[PDB]
Amino acid sequence: VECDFSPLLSGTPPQVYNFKRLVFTNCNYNLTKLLSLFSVNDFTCSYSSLILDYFSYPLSMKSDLSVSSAGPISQFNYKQSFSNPTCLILATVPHNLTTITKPLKYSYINKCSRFLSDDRTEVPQLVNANQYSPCVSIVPSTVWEDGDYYRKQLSPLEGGGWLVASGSTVAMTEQLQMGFGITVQYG
């Protein structure tokens, strides 16, 4: 049986901090077959299950999409496991792939911090592997304007204090550019 990539061939891919995760088990799949539908620009690489994350992502930020980077993408948006084989692929949607639709712009989280109820301690919220930023609950799916400041007062059950985030934007390109994060679990 063949793994179905159809979920990602239709609709608007989310922004990096809302990466869409597809999990594949018990099916055959050829990654090159999936990539033959795109115009691949870059890839970096370092069975039981295949995890495929995808999102809108501008090629001009390719240096930020790296395990090495102390930049905001790896700190606050998206981080892959360091213990499994992984790949990162940047590709462009070709004109004859008409069913992937464009968002208004590219967005990413530039800062995400808790401010504790002592009114003194700021705690940067570094994203963990295979997890979303805690700030996805306050950052909209598309950031309204570069530099937007989002904030929420937390409840006692949530730990008190505040959650704050800052959003950044990059102008949309003529063809949508995308990122793919792949992690394999070998048995």
Partner: antibody, heavy 127, light 111 residues
Framework: QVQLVQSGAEVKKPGSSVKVSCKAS????????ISWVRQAPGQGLEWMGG????????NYAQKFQGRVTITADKSTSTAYMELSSLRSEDTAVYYC????????????????????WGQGTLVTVSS | VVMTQSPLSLPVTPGEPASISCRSS???????????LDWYLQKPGQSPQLLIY???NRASGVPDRFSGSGSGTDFTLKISRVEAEDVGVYYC????????FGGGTKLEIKR
């Protein structure tokens, strides 16, 4: 609600620098945007710059870029405005002002619905 | 962004309505659906105070007599029945990116 108490009046020689303070009470100080606005005698209001303390990110009007430094100290809930190379045209009442705090988010990084105002600080630049 | 406020001064007979206009050199309507225009009043010898924010939102404790309207470049502050307490200088303020005040309108009592 919120109270903004500014430091007292000052007299400064031309060419020197002045630093005015604004101590805030009520609410989480580091979370809300604070601005500085001045008013020369008989003239209108003029926005100088602002800061959100938790970010430490201050912005300024182009007219005051390079002469004004706005800072904030969460240990005392105080914002500061320092203006250097004082000229007689800088004689003015300086006000601190804080957002009302109920906008759902701050577009572009900062909120400017100035619901709270300090009492003003008169700065007289003269020989 | 240039804000043109008119008139410069406004004598108003007590009890009668008043209107102040503010025209911006570029649209103040943000993609989030709000117009970034505030109205402030500064009474004699006092600090400024907020009347209207984000085009038409009345600030807390501001009487129903004040209302703001408009979208894009033309905005109006209206006072339904002017009162002695209302004397002072009214300022509009655009907040689309970097705040800037209009020149002010001095409201005084007509006699």
């Amino acid at each position: 609600q919120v109270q903004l108490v500014q430091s007292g009046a000052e007299v400064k020689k031309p060419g020197s620098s002045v630093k005015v303070s604004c101590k805030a009470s009520g609410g989480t100080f580091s979370i809300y945007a604070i601005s500085w606005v001045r008013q020369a005698p008989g003239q209108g209001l003029e926005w100088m710059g602002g800061i959100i303390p938790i970010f430490g990110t201050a912005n300024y009007a182009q007219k005051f870029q390079g002469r004004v430094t706005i800072t904030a100290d969460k240990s005392t809930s105080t914002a500061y405005m320092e203006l250097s190379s004082l000229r007689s045209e800088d004689t003015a009442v300086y006000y601190c002002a804080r957002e009302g705090g109920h906008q759902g988010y701050c577009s572009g990084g900062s909120c400017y619905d100035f619901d709270y105002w300090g009492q003003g600080t008169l700065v007289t630049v003269s020989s | 962004v240039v804000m043109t406020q008119s008139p410069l001064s406004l004598p108003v007979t007590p009890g009668e309505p008043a209107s102040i206009s503010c025209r911006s050199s570029q649209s103040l309507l943000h993609s989030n659906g709000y117009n970034y225009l505030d109205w402030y009043l500064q009474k004699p010898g006092q600090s400024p105070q907020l009347l209207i924010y984000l085009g038409s939102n009345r600030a807390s404790g501001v009487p129903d007599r004040f209302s703001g309207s408009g979208s894009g470049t033309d905005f109006t502050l209206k006072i339904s029945r002017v009162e002695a307490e209302d004397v002072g200088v009214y300022y509009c303020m655009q907040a689309l990116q970097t705040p800037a005040f209009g020149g002010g309108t001095k409201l005084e009592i007509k006699r």
